[PDB]
Amino acid sequence: MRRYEVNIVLNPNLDQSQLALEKEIIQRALENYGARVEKVEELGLRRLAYPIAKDPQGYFLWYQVEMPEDRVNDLARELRIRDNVRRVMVVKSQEPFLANA
């Protein structure tokens, strides 16, 4: 298995039942691909520097996961199929390379 980080930018205008239904669905199809969730971040409402889908803002999720590599591209095709989800970016985890230190 490898360490990945999933980013999610979805509709900023979502009401509660809605938004935590998208969250429920993401998580559902995370465990569905054999991914184990390590840690989570929600930065939430944030101001994009250019409009994404006609919309000046976006809602921000960050997950750290570990999972089967042979899947991770399917994992992505899946997170993307969802309608309200504007970006999905999955990265490999890397060490913190600094400077000025």
């Binding site: 970006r87 390379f97 600094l98 400077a99």
Partner: protein
């Protein structure tokens, strides 16, 4: 008038999610800045870049901007 990493603390070059710091290395327009302005090393700047381009696709950073005065 001197360089960027001059004004900054120990900070992560590989964290694409940090806009507060990363906006600093962009120019007036979104243009990633020259080394001579960022004061980085080769490996440094080369990492900074790819980290920006990521942030950009995530929507956090400008692909481009508009010029004021002129």
């Amino acid at each position: 008038k001197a360089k960027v990493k001059a004004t900054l603390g120990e900070f992560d070059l590989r964290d694409y999610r940090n806009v507060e710091v990363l906006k600093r290395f962009l120019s007036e327009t979104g243009k990633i800045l020259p080394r001579r302005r960022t004061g980085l090393s080769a490996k440094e700047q080369r990492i900074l870049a790819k980290t920006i381009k990521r942030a950009r696709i995530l929507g956090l950073l400008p692909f481009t901007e508009k010029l004021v005065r002129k």
